[PDB]
């Protein structure tokens, strides 16, 4: 079994928790409910453990959680496609990942969540342009319908494998 330490980041309310809980517990939280989650899965023939750290902008101090962050192997950079501010804020998160990891080359996937919503304000081309500037994949997801959810996390696993031997 190969373990992948994945960290989900992004601005308030973009669906970080909803994506993680959909992936791991197969449940969509329509409540706004402001942890760590694990699931064993087979990815490209490899028995894999997805070890997900679900972050937030308001959390109680925890030295161990800071240790979890620094050892994260790949990051999902989440914005919501109906939240232009969350898209604008991606650049802050990308820079902060590099600080937390003390590294210029960290596996990352850009995720545009809430793709089920018709009130879109971030065009796919905008998000593609941003991802291209960063040299990372862009994937649209809906934690609600599950569209793209496995693809986003499995793409991050594949980005980690491109970066380092697992």
């Amino acid at each position: 079994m190969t373990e992948y330490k994945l960290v989900v980041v992004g601005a308030d309310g973009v669906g970080k928790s909803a994506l993680t809980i959909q992936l791991i517990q197969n449940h969509f939280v329509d409540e706004y409910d402001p942890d760590s989650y694990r699931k064993q899965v087979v990815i490209d023939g490899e028995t894999s453990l997805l070890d997900i750290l679900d972050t937030a902008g308001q959390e109680e101090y925890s030295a161990m959680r800071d240790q979890y962050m620094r050892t994260g192997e790949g990051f999902l950079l989440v914005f919501a496609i109906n939240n232009t501010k969350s898209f604008e804020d991606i650049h802050h998160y990308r820079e902060q990942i590099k600080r937390v990891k003390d590294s210029e080359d960290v596996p990352m996937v850009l995720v545009g969540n809430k793709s089920d919503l018709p009130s879109r304000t971030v065009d796919t081309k905008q998000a593609q342009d941003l991802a291209r500037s960063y040299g990372i994949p862009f994937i649209e997801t809906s934690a609600k319908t599950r569209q793209g959810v496995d693809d986003a996390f499995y793409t991050l696993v594949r980005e980690i494998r491109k970066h380092k031997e697992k």
Binding site: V9, A56, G57, H92, Q96, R99
Partner: peptide
Amino acid sequence: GXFVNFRNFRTFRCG
């Protein structure tokens, strides 16, 4: 906004 430190993703408001 920004981040309060360089260890995690806790934010601060610039407003």
